[PDB]
Amino acid sequence: VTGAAGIGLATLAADGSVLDTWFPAPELTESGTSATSRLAVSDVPVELAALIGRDDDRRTETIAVRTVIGSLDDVAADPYDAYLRLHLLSHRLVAPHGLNAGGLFGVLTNVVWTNHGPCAIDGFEAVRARLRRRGPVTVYGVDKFPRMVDYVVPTGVRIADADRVRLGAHLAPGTTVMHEGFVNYNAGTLGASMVEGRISAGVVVGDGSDVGGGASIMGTVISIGKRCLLGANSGLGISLGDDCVVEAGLYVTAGTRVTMPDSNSVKARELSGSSNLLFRRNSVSGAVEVLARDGQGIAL
Amino acid sequence: VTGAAGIGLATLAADGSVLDTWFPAPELTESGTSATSRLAVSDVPVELAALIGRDDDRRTETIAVRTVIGSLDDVAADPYDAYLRLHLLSHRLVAPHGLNAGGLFGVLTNVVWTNHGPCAIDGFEAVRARLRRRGPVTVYGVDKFPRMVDYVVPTGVRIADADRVRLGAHLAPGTTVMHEGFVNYNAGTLGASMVEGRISAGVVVGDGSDVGGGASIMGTLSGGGTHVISIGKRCLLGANSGLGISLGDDCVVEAGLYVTAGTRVTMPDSNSVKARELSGSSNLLFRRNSVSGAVEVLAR
Amino acid sequence: VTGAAGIGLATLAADGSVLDTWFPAPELTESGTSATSRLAVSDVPVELAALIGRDDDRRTETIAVRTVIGSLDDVAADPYDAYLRLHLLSHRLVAPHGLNAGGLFGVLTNVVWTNHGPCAIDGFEAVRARLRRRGPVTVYGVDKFPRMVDYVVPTGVRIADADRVRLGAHLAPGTTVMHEGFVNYNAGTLGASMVEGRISAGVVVGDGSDVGGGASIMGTLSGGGTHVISIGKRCLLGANSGLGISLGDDCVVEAGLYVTAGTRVTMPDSNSVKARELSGSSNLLFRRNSVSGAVEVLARDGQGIA
Ligand SMILES: [Mg+2]
Ligand SMILES: [Mg+2]
Ligand SMILES: [Mg+2]
Ligand SMILES: [Mg+2]
Ligand code: NA
Ligand code: NA
C-alpha cells in the first residue's frame, strides 16, 4: 500500500469550497493517514509564501496546505486529495490505473477558469464586472478539470494546443499531442507517441503507437499496445495488442462484425487485446475485414 | 410584438466601427422602437462607470449605451442590435429561432480579439507593437463572433474548452460541451445534453440527446442546404458520425456513420429510400452493415 | 536565387538558445549571405527599442537582430533563419514550397508559450512560481511552432480559433479558418477558401476550394506518404471526409468518405483502380455507394474520366 503527500497552494471560493490546488512537488510515500492541514508559518516554502493572500474582486483566498493520502487505492475524499491524485499522474509518478481515479467528478468543484485565476460559479457575473477594472476578463473554460500544463510541464513532451490536455493526463517522454489530439485524466501514453486524436479517460497507449488526426479511442477499459497505428478519422472500441493498424476513416466498435481471412466472421470484441491485426473496410464489398500482419496469422 | 433592451458597454474602433458590446443584463420588452443611444452620466450603472474610457495603444474607446430592439422579428440593423440578439440567445432569454438571426455576418465587424481586448484589423500591427510595451500580445481569434463565456457564463453548464462556443450559442441547464464539442450562434441544446461534436448555426438539440465525439451535425455536403435540421429528445449520435436530416425522439446514429439527406437507406422490408424521406421520424436506428456495407435503418 | 532579410525582436533563454523571433516587416532580397547580427543602437527601429530587455523571472532576454537569408533554397541555418522563413510564408510574401521549409523541427527550440511570453523548458517550474507573483501563469502550448496570429494577422482573413493556425501557415485573402479548421506551416490556401478541416504541412488548397468540418487532408494512413498532395480550384471536401491523393479542379469527396491512395475505386465502366492512379485529375466525385458499400468515382461535368 502506497500513500502520497504534497504541499499545495489551494484557492478557495467565498463559501470556502476548494476551487483548485497546485502541488509543485508531489511525492509517493508509505501508506499513512488521509488528511489536509493548513501549513504553519514556518512550514510554508518561501516560493509559496509570496503567493498566499486574498483576492477581494474574486472573493477568493489562496492558502498553503499539506495534503496526505494514506492509500492510493482509496477513493479521493475531497478536492485536495483529487488534485493530488491528478498531479501524481501528470508528474508520471504513477501510471494510469496506478491509483484509484474513481468518483473525481463527484468530488471536484465546477470552476470558472479565467485569466485572473480560478473563480466560483457563484456570483461570477458580478466578479467579472469587478475584474474588468483590471483589464479584459477571459474565461478559458468552466469545468471540474483544469489544463495540465498550468500545474506541471512534464519533460520530453510537446503539446501543440494545451487546452486539449486535462490535468491528470500522463504523457510519457517522446510524446507529442498535436492540435487535434485530446488526452483525458487517468489516461495517456506509456512511451513515445504521436497523439492527434482522442484518448478517453482510463485509456493507455503503448510505446511507439500513434493516434492519427481525429481518431476516437472509446473509454470502452480499452488500451493499445506497442507500435499500433490508428489512421486519421478512425475509431476504436476494443483493445489492441501490439503491431495493430486500424485504417484511416474506419470506426471499429465492439459489436462490429469483422470478417476474417478464413471468411468466418466474429464480433470485434472477440479480437480485443489481440496482436498483429489490420482492420479495414473493403472498398469493393463494404465489409469490415481483419487481416493478419507479417505472416503472423490471427489469434482470437 | 416582442422587443428587447439592454444597457451595454461598447468598444469602438478608431474609425467609429463597433467592435463589440457587452450587455450584463439584457431583457425582453414589449415591442418598441429600435435604437441605440449613449447613456447620460446619471444613467450609467455604477459597476459600468469605472469601465468607460479610451485606450490610446489600441486606439479604441469604451462607452456606455442603451440598445432597444423594437421587434425580435426584424433583422439586426447594426452591430449593437446584433450583439444584443446574441446575448439574448446565450442568456437563454430566447431560444434558437426565437428571434431573427439572419444577416449577422453582414452586420458584424471583423475583430482581432486580444488579451488586451477587442482591436480593429486596421493598423493592428502598429497596435500590437504598442501593446507589447505592456506585455505579450496574444490574439485569440480574428472573426465577427467572439467567445460566449466572455459575455455570460450560463448556469447549469460545463464548457471544457470555451474557445468552442460562439456568443449566440444557447446551452440549456445540464449541458456539457466537451473539448471536441462546438456550438455556433443561434444553435444549442434545449435541455440536458452531452455535446462532444459539432452543432451548426440554426441547429437545435433536444433534452437528453447526446452528441458523440467528433459528430458532425449539418456539416458540409450533408444535404441540399435549404432547411435547418434539429434533433429531438433522447437521441444518440455516435462518435465521428454525421447527420444531414432532422431526427425526432429516441434516434441513434452509429459511430462512424454519416447519414446525409441523399444517403439511400435500406429498410427492414428490403425497400430503400433516401434518408430525407425519414427526416423528423422517431425511434430510428441508422447503421452500416459491417457485412454488406449497406446503410440500413431499423426501429428501436 | 532569392534571399530575404528582416529586423527581428528575438527572445533568448537563460542558456542563450533562441526561443522565438518576431519580424514586424520581413522582405525578399537579392541572393546574398546568410547571417543574423545584433543591431547597433542606431539601427533599432523606435517601436522595437521600447521592447528590448531582460526578464529576471523568466531568465530570458529580448534583443534586436537583423536576419538575412542568402538563398531561400537553402535549409534554415538556425532558429532566426527558421522564424524568418515562417514569417515570409504567413506574410504571403512566399507561397508554400516557394522556400525550403525542410528541417525546421531539428533547428527550432521547443518552447513553453505562456501568457508572460516564451519560456525555456529548463527550470520552468521555478519560473512558474516566480511568475505567479505577477498573477496567474497560463501555458498556451509546449511546442517548437507558435501561433501565427501572435506574429502577423494577414488581411482579408478570419480565424475563428487562432490556436489552430501555426506560424508559417499561408492564408490567402477571402480565407476563413473555422474552429475545426487547422493549418500547419508551409501549407494553406492560395485563394478564397472555407477551411473547417485539417491542412497538413506542405498541403496547398486552390482558390474557391472548401474543406468541410473534420475533413482530413493527408492524415495518418492516408497514403504511402512520400510526396505532398494538393487540391486545385473549386474542390469540396465533405464533413468528416479524408483525402490522401491530390485533386485537380472541380472534384468533390462526399461527407464521411476517406479516400486514401491505396483505396480501390470503381469507375463508371465498372473497372477499378487504386485512387492514387487518379491523383491530380479534375472533375471527379468520390462517394461510397450507400447500397453496395463500394467506393466509386464519377465524372462531375458530363465528360468522363479515363
Ligand atoms: Mg522511449
Ligand atoms: Mg477537433
Ligand atoms: Mg485556446
Ligand atoms: Mg478544368
Ligand atoms: Na483551443
Ligand atoms: Na478571390
Residues near A143 by beta carbon (within 8 Å), at least 6 away in sequence: A110, A111, A113, B158, B159, B160
* CATH code of the domain containing C141: 3.30.60.70
The residue segments making up the domain with residue C93 are 1-107
Neighbours of chain C (3+ CB pairs under 8 A): A, B
3-state DSSP assignment of residue C153: coil
Taking CA C13 as the corner, what is the angle to CA C10 and CA C14, rounded to the nearest 5 degrees?
Answer: 135
Q: How far is CA C149 from the centre of its chain?
A: 12
Boundary (domain end) residue, out of A147, A173, A203: A147
Backbone CA torsion sign across C33, C34, C35, C39: positive
Residues A216, C240: Cα–Cα separation, whole Å: 13
Tell me, yes or no, whether A97 and A220 share the same domain. no
Which residues in chain C touch residue A282, judged by CB atoms under 8 angstroms apart?
293
For A286, the closest of B147, B152, B294 (CB atoms) is B294
Tell me, yes or no, whether C138 and C62 share the same domain. no
- Report whether C105 contacts C144 (CB < 8 A): yes
Which residues in chain B touch residue A140, judged by CB atoms under 8 angstroms apart?
161-162
Residues C117, C11: Cα–Cα separation, whole Å: 9
DSSP track, C133-151: TSS---EEEEESS-BGGGT
Tell me, yes or no, whether A60 and A167 share the same domain. no
- Report whether C284 contacts A277 (CB < 8 A): no
Tell me, yes or no, whether B155 and B32 share the same domain. no
Pairs across A and B, CB distance < 8 A: 110
Would you name the residues of B annotated as active-site residues?
Answer: 196
CA atoms within 13 A on the CB side of C94: 27
Boundary (domain end) residue, out of B147, B173, B203: B147
Taking CA A34 as the corner, what is the angle to CA C136 and CA A219, rounded to the nearest 5 degrees?
Answer: 70
Taking CA A247 as the corner, what is the angle to CA A246 and CA A249, rounded to the nearest 5 degrees?
Answer: 115
3-state DSSP assignment of residue B107: helix
* CATH code of the domain containing A219: 2.160.10.10
Tell me, yes or no, whether B154 and B37 share the same domain. no
Distance from CA of A143 to the nearest CA of B (A): 5
Which residues in chain A touch residue C244, judged by CB atoms under 8 angstroms apart?
248
Q: How far is CA B161 from CA A139, A142, B196, in A?
A: 9, 8, 11
* CATH code of the domain containing A3: 3.30.70.2010
Residues B87, C266: Cα–Cα separation, whole Å: 51
Q: Give which of A111, A166, A179, A230 to mutate to test C binding, by max C Cβ within 10 Å.
A: A179
Residues B112, C293: Cα–Cα separation, whole Å: 46
Closest CA to A96 of A189, A213, A175, A3: A189
User: Number of folded domains in chain B?
Assistant: 3
Tell me, yes or no, whether C163 and C302 share the same domain. yes
- Name the active-site residue from A61, A196, A270, A289: A196
- CA–centroid distance, C140 to ligand 3, in Å, is 7
Which residues in chain A touch residue B155, judged by CB atoms under 8 angstroms apart?
121
Strand partners, B287: B296
Tell me, yes or no, whether B60 and B73 share the same domain. yes
Q: What is the DSSP letter of A114?
A: E
- Report whether C211 contacts C196 (CB < 8 A): yes
Boundary (domain end) residue, out of A75, A107, A139: A107
Which cell is A267 given?
464480433
Residue contact A142–B157, C-beta within 8 A: yes
DSSP track, A164-193: GBBTTEEE-TT-EE-TT-EE-TTEEESS--
Neighbours of chain A (3+ CB pairs under 8 A): B, C
Tell me, yes or no, whether C129 and C225 share the same domain. no
Tell me, yes or no, whether A197 and A274 share the same domain. yes
Tell me, yes or no, whether C210 and C80 share the same domain. no
Taking CA B187 as the corner, what is the angle to CA B299 and CA B150, rounded to the nearest 5 degrees?
Answer: 140
Which cell is C50 given?
521600447
Tell me, yes or no, whether C263 and C215 share the same domain. yes
For B292, the closest of C179, C240, C293 (CB atoms) is C293
Q: What is the resolution of this structure in A?
A: 2.2
Tell me, yes or no, whether C70 and C188 share the same domain. no
Which cell is A23 given?
502541488
B152: enclosing H helix or E strand: none
